[PDB]
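Lab notebook, page 48
Experiment: co-folding of the full assembly
Goal: obtain a model of how the components sit together before planning crosslinking
Operator: M.T.
Materials (sequences as entered):
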Amino acid sequence: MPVAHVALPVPLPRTFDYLLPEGMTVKAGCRVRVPFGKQQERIGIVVSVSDASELPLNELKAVVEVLDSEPVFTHSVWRLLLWAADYYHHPIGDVLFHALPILL
Amino acid sequence: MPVAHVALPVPLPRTFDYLLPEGMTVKAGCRVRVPFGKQQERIGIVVSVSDASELPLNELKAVVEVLDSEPVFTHSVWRLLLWAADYYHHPIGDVLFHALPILLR
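Observation: model returned without errors.
Model output:
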């Protein structure tokens, strides 16, 4: 066939980069709505905010809206979760979202 | 202000799609060389081969070389691994490349 989906030993937190529009401000632990595929919407959780992306600053889709003004996660809880994710080999996305419900 | 590294509720096995040039043929459980960043190589393991990718079939970098003629993993082992990765929530890539050394050696 054509498309060979392959696995590679990727860096610890495999995340998706998105641009923050002018004037929109978000911090770690906040949920945001973002584009994805060609059709698109979905809720995500910001892990970090850098001034560098592995791809050009221009061909990055942009964040839609910020659902939280303050981290839905406790400073401690967050530290713990990022740890668990790393220590036990679990995708950050998974721990966080599967962990969100139990928290609320 | 610019970017932000985001975590998302991604599907079971988060994999990287690669185009198979014309005439090149691979099966599940085999290693392959593949481009990566803007410039250099890496070795991976094919988990599946379909007729579609979430991205434009032309926008995908192409497979370089196929290291294995046959699955370096056994049909049983394979099934277990994929299972272990899903059931315990471990990156499939992570389980496969770690166990490789063990299983063989």
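Interpretation: Chain A touches chain B through 49 residues (CB under 8 Å).
Next step: discuss with group before ordering constructs.
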